[PDB]
């Protein structure tokens, strides 16, 4: 539906939608911009990420509420709780599949710089992770391994190509630690990764401007917040 | 799309959607329930109202953000702000027209008890009021008069048939005062209505149980909050 709108108009409208807190519209505008086929700038990658993280965040919150009610039900109240949890689940899967589709066609393959490639691979890890949260069985196993593989490729590039305080490197490590703790049943791997990431960023802070220091220390606090939750 | 689902399943899912904060789904489930053609109970009227008030509330908040940006623009940045404000405006009008359609087909005509009839006429006033907020010109005049007429019929019934502390009577008076202040350019009528409503409810509080007292005084505080904003 966005095929007739200029790329620059799609970007401008995504920024308007963000101001209006209209995140579904924001995601649709950014999907349209990606589908123009040009690479995204740093600012545009961030719009894409913010839009979808807010859309999927709404669905994840709802899915948790409904899953909890369903689990409690398990007086008979009929199929309705399961049906509606499934509806929300299907819509959530559809959003994840859309994002993964954009990454595969063709954002990741054209991303040559470390900052873009790590950003997109982290996104690939995150959206497979959201799929894993609602998956069951071995179906679940291949999804978990897809998330793992994407995060691992991102980490390998980030460690070779970015400083330990780079915010995208920090955010990737934070989310991969969350993957280990919440999805992969590997709380020790989670704690080790978050601690090493934190310590290596601390040792690099002296190299940063006031503004970069603020950006890095904000994400380090998130790693610290998790380490406090986990230990 | 809800034609194949049982009425009771639609109601149950509306309550689930409210818990999950999925207000668009909640409105769709309640629209489906109304379209079954049976009258709504007090609890079901309240679900219908909560659902649509949240949906339209999101649109009104967005429309205000975009209208403000548009008015500021009036460097040339092209048609995009106007286009996107119009998109949001159209969707908002569509929601209002949907609610008004449900009231006209056939909720109001089958509502014989005071509590149902006043509730639906208040809703008719509110949704024409939301249409008036985005309307221009004389188009605007007939919309304002539709809101007025609906509120006036509701007030006439409420004054004849309900005690001055009845929460629906109180809410109707609050919203009609807001209509006078914000839409009809009649701040004196707004202040007079809110003050008389407040004073007449205060004099009736002695007749109420602890629980009814809590329900009434909560809405009286809203009338007081507006009177403080307006004087
Ligand atoms: O509360 C959280 C915290 O999740 C994180 C914490 C640190 C890094 C990354 C995440 P996330 O990508 O799972 O959102 N996420 C969340 C976000 C939106 C909806 C719901 Cl239900 C949960
Ligand atoms: O802030 C308000 C206050 O409006 C009222 C105050 C007292 C009674 C009735 C109303 P409302 O029916 O205009 O929401 N409403 C509002 C509700 C949702 C979105 C936006 Cl932008 C505004
Ligand atoms: Cl459903
Ligand atoms: Cl490449
Ligand atoms: Cl638009
Ligand atoms: Cl009747
Ligand atoms: Mg072009
Ligand atoms: Mg049932
Ligand atoms: Mg399923
Ligand atoms: Mg390239
Ligand atoms: Mg480098
Ligand atoms: Mg039936
Ligand atoms: Mg422009
Ligand atoms: Mg218009
Ligand atoms: Mg009747
Ligand atoms: Mg009576």
Swiss-Prot record, chains A, B:
Tissue-specificity statement: Present mainly in tissues enriched in stratified squamous keratinizing epithelium.
GO biological process: cAMP/PKA signal transduction; establishment of skin barrier; intrinsic apoptotic signaling pathway in response to DNA damage; keratinization; keratinocyte development; keratinocyte proliferation; negative regulation of innate immune response; negative regulation of keratinocyte proliferation
InterPro entries: 14-3-3, 14-3-3_CS, 14-3-3_dom_sf, 14-3-3_domain, 14-3-3_sigma
Keywords: Cytoplasm, Nucleus, Phosphoprotein, Secreted, Ubl conjugation
Subcellular location as annotated: Cytoplasm; Nucleus; Secreted
A single GO molecular function term of this UniProt record: protein kinase C inhibitor activity
PROSITE patterns registered for this protein in UniProt: 1433_1, 1433_2
Site (Interaction with phosphoserine on interacting protein): 60, 129
Sites of Phosphoserine modification: 9
Family: Belongs to the 14-3-3 family.
Functional summary from the UniProt entry: Adapter protein implicated in the regulation of a large spectrum of both general and specialized signaling pathways. Binds to a large number of partners, usually by recognition of a phosphoserine or phosphothreonine motif. Binding generally results in the modulation of the activity of the binding partner. Promotes cytosolic retention of GBP1 GTPase by binding to phosphorylated GBP1, thereby inhibiting the innate immune response. Also acts as a TP53/p53-regulated inhibitor of G2/M progression.
Subunit structure of this chain's protein: Homodimer. Interacts with KRT17 and SAMSN1. Found in a complex with XPO7, EIF4A1, ARHGAP1, VPS26A, VPS29 and VPS35. Interacts with GAB2. Interacts with SRPK2. Interacts with COPS6. Interacts with COP1; this interaction leads to proteasomal degradation. Interacts with the 'Thr-369' phosphorylated form of DAPK2. Interacts with PI4KB. Interacts with SLITRK1. Interacts with LRRK2; this interaction is dependent on LRRK2 phosphorylation.
Protein name as it appears in the record: 14-3-3 protein sigma
């Amino acid at each position: 539906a966005m095929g007739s709108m200029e790329r620059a108009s799609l970007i401008q409208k995504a920024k308007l939608a963000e101001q209006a807190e209209r995140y579904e519209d924001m995601a649709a505008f950014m999907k349209g911009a990606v589908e123009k086929g040009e690479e995204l700038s740093c600012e545009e990658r961030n719009l894409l990420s913010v839009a979808y993280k807010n859309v999927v965040g709404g669905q994840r919150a709802a899915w948790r509420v409904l899953s909890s009610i369903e689990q409690k039900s398990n007086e008979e109240k009929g199929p309705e709780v399961r049906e509606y949890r499934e509806k929300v689940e299907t819509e959530l899967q559809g959003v994840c599949d859309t994002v993964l589709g954009l990454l595969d066609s063709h954002l990741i393959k054209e991303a040559g710089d470390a900052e873009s490639r790590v950003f997109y691979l982290k996104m690939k890890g995150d959206y497979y992770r959201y799929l894993a949260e609602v998956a069951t069985g071995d179906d679940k196993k291949r999804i978990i391994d897809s998330a793992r593989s994407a995060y691992q490729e991102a980490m390998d590039i980030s460690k070779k190509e970015m400083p330990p305080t780079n915010p995208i490197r920090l955010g990737l490590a934070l989310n991969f630690s969350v993957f280990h703790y919440e999805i992969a049943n590997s709380p020790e791997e989670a704690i080790s990764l978050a601690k090493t990431t934190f310590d290596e960023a601390m040792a690099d802070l002296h190299t940063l401007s006031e503004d970069s220091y603020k950006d890095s220390t904000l994400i380090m606090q998130l790693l610290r917040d998790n380490l406090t939750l986990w230990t």
